[PDB]
From a paper:
Sirtuins are NAD+-dependent protein lysine deacylases that sense the cellular nutrient status, regulate energy metabolism and stress responses, and have been implicated in aging processes and aging-related diseases. Sirtuins feature differing substrate acyl selectivities. Here, we analyse modulation of Sirt6 and other isoforms by quercetin and its derivatives in activity and binding assays and through crystal structure analyses of modulator complexes of Sirt6 and Sirt2. Our results hence reveal sites and mechanisms for Sirtuin modulation by quercetin derivatives and provide helpful insights for Sirt6 modulator development.
Catechin gallate (CG) is the most potent quercetin derivative reported to inhibit rather than activate Sirt6-dependent deacetylation (IC50 2.5 ± 0.1 μM). Testing CG in our MS assay confirmed the surprising inhibitory effect of this closely quercetin-related compound, albeit with slightly lower potency (IC50 80 ± 15 μM). To rationalize the inhibitory effect, we determined a crystal structure of a Sirt6/CG complex at 2.0 Å resolution. The bound inhibitor CG is well-defined by electron density and occupies the same binding region as the activator quercetin, with identical positions for their catechol moieties but a rotated chromen-4-one in GC to accommodate its additional, bulky trihydroxy benzoyl group. The chromen-4-one now interacts with Trp71 of the acyl channel exit, and the trihydroxy benzoyl group forms hydrophobic interactions with the other side of the exit funnel and a polar contact to the Gly155 backbone. The inhibitor does not overlap with the binding pocket for acetyl substrate but the catechol group assumes a position partly overlapping with the NAM moiety of the NAD+ cosubstrate. Testing CG inhibition at different NAD+ concentrations did not result in significant changes of residual activity, however, indicating that the inhibition is not based on NAD+ competition. The inhibitor CG differs from activators in a slight rotation of the catechol moiety, and more drastically in a tilted position of the chroman and the presence of its additional bulky substituent, orienting them toward N-terminus and Val154, respectively. The Val154/Gly155 peptide bond flips to provide space, but this and other differences in protein conformation are subtle. The bulky group pointing toward the N-terminus is CG’s dihydrochroman, and its strong tilt compared to quercetin/cyanidin is due to the saturated C-ring in CG.
Residue numbers in the entry:
A (entry chain A): 10 to 169, 177 to 298
B (entry chain B): 15 to 169, 177 to 298
Amino acid sequence: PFTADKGKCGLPEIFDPPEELERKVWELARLVWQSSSVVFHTGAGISTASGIPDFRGPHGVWTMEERGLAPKFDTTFESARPTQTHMALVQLERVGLLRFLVSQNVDGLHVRSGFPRDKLAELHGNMFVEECAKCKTQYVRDTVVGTMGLKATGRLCTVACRGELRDTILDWEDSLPDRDLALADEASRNADLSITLGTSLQIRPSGNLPLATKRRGGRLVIVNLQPTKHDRHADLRIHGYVDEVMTRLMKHLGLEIPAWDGPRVLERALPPLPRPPTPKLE
Amino acid sequence: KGKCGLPEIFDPPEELERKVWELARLVWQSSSVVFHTGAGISTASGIPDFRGPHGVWTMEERGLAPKFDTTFESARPTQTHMALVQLERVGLLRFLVSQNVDGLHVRSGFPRDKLAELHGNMFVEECAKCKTQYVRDTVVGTMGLKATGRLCTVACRGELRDTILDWEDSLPDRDLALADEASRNADLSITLGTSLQIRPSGNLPLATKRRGGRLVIVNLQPTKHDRHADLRIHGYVDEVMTRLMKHLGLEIPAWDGPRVLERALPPLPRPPTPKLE
Ligand SMILES: Nc1ncnc2c1ncn2[C@@H]1O[C@H](COP(=O)(O)OP(=O)(O)OC[C@H]2O[C@H](O)[C@H](O)[C@@H]2O)[C@@H](O)[C@H]1O
Ligand SMILES: Nc1ncnc2c1ncn2[C@@H]1O[C@H](COP(=O)(O)OP(=O)(O)OC[C@H]2O[C@H](O)[C@H](O)[C@@H]2O)[C@@H](O)[C@H]1O
Ligand SMILES: O=C(O[C@H]1Cc2c(O)cc(O)cc2O[C@@H]1c1ccc(O)c(O)c1)c1cc(O)c(O)c(O)c1
Ligand SMILES: O=C(O[C@H]1Cc2c(O)cc(O)cc2O[C@@H]1c1ccc(O)c(O)c1)c1cc(O)c(O)c(O)c1
Ligand SMILES: [Zn+2]
Ligand SMILES: [Zn+2]
């Protein structure tokens, strides 16, 4: 743990100039329109505009540690609002333009945004989730459960069981949830488009999943302020704030970014809603 | 640049719950409420403060850089920003005094005739000739009340200039006069995310205490005037303010993107009041 390699921390950030940024987001529009099966891969960079620090950015948790300083939080995990990027992905799933959502974030804000749990894989677990040791039953709480490392929380199952409730937060040596990884594996492989937002792609197998989309001819788009493990394999790379990227994208798609009325859990995706007709391309 | 990077205080859960109940009680019994904001109400949208552990001046002093997790154009009003829209709309807020240049008060749709922008607005340029101001969709590009290179279109062709005060620059006499009036004639002054080290900006809440007004200070770090507070809350303003709106029975209204409202609209209905003693 103390020993855990935290990979490359504190790389310099890149900024596309505004004419390049505009042209890259249009091209992204073009790929979303042409693409039958779009998967989104997300990471700690999509939550930074809500006051939760990343791991490996300039003021990341691992970065600050390495220079002997502390990360800073501007909210509690309970008071934290889903970002524009979060709500734009809610909408893209509602209108049937997102097929699946693969996240490394434990920050719980995908679930709180309202995003359907049967189209999300939480590869690293969820700070608001506990799970019965005995029956595998998961409980989505309004407050952080209080333990990390798949340890006992101090509450007992109430299904009719009384099994031991435990946190979902993996430690360094912990095998990824096999249900969430298999679903994420299948959705990455059958994707013809994988878009990574605010991940540096350094954690295996999480950060390799987008690469499975490039077999039998899929396209990869990396959106990221810093470099990432896989920039070499990207058809498009956008250096820019995820919220600026995703609001320009929704505007190109003619969709609005939906309201957030506070924490909610949806188990199962609702039937698809209307979406605008497509531009002619070529 | 004053005291930069003092350590943070955190009220424990029961004390925090009891302080916000009591703020609720002060809001119910108060005739004329003013809100005094600073850079701390925007940190949960990825704009750093000036004097916090990772504030701009604080990081300068340590020869490190501040971090923006957004652009000023992409920044979204926080829960705090929208709760203050709602409290003005139901008539519980008399006036808003802000030290912020971030331009989000206005973008939140808060009415300009009830706001004082003590330190200017990065989206605002002002004709030197006819004093007409323009609220833009992008930051105007200059600081220090310098020429932006656009010209007036009032029929004037005058020189347009940024509104961002520098260190030696007097405060806008209109915004300071209404700020002072409002501070003097209040019975409750509430400060949110300001250290209160800048004068006169940070001295205004004190004018409420003369002829026996109350003052509430809500801040993570200490502040110049903790001594003159009738209540001090050591909490994230979003948590403080979401629980306050709950105690008053109000909703936090929806942001529909960047909008400018010049003049306050007519007051909307509010819940009736509790019994107090
Ligand atoms: N607003 C933003 N816009 C775009 N990029 C951003 C923004 N803010 C930050 N970033 C960038 O977004 C990227 C965030 O990458 P990392 O900090 O490694 O987080 P992970 O999700 O990849 O970490 C995976 C796991 O490792 C941990 O040990 C846990 O186990 C995590 O679950 C960086 O390059 C930032 O430049
Ligand atoms: N989520 C939060 N909740 C509560 N407090 C917070 C939060 N985040 C930060 N803070 C606190 O919020 C406080 C922020 O205070 P300062 O950083 O001095 O900003 P100012 O408005 O007073 O600066 C005045 C002028 O000086 C400048 O030069 C410009 O001219 C400004 O206009 C700190 O104590 C944090 O502890
Ligand atoms: O994981 C928990 O703590 C957070 C803060 C943190 C940290 O300060 C150091 C660190 O090594 C890990 C770490 O993980 C989280 C975090 C950090 C950064 C992010 O970007 C992000 O989204 C989330 C956690 C989990 C539970 O189940 C609990 O019940 C509980 O009380 C706390
Ligand atoms: O002010 C501008 O930049 C921000 C970063 C910054 C800084 O790095 C040093 C400093 O002295 C002032 C300063 O002011 C801003 C700021 C920072 C922190 C806050 O909390 C906050 O509300 C606002 C600004 C304004 C324009 O019109 C421009 O065209 C332009 O390029 C920049
Ligand atoms: Zn059980
Ligand atoms: Zn003019």
